[PDB]
């Protein structure tokens, strides 16, 4: 069996120009490890960016699933 948090989910990241980028990942991934893959897809570094889900900033150490980030969940991207 593949347990909860280790199936592919596709998270939608939304920038300040209304562009969407889809990142395939696992619910068990930390926000930090999510940012690492995101950054390679969008041409930045994790330390240059902030992610928010519906108003609140996501902390690097905490998992996507703990923030209730699921397949097709939208996140808002900001650059420092």
């Amino acid at each position: 069996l593949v347990p909860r948090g280790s199936h592919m989910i596709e998270v939608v990241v939304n920038d300040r120009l209304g562009k969407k980028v889809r990142v395939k990942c696992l619910g068990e991934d930390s926000v930090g490890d999510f940012k690492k893959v995101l950054s390679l897809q969008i041409g930045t570094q994790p330390n240059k960016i902030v992610l928010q889900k519906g108003g609140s900033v996501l902390k690097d150490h905490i998992s996507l699933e703990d923030y209730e980030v699921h397949d097709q969940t939208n996140l808002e991207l900001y650059y420092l």
Binding site: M8, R22, V23, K24, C25, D33, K36, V37
Partner: peptide
């Protein structure tokens, strides 16, 4: 913007657990 296969190349490089097929 990327397939599971391509995403996994990135994950593997970063030492993360792979996304199941």
């Amino acid at each position: 913007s990327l397939s599971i296969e391509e995403t996994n190349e990135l994950r593997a490089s970063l030492g993360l657990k792979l996304i199941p097929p």
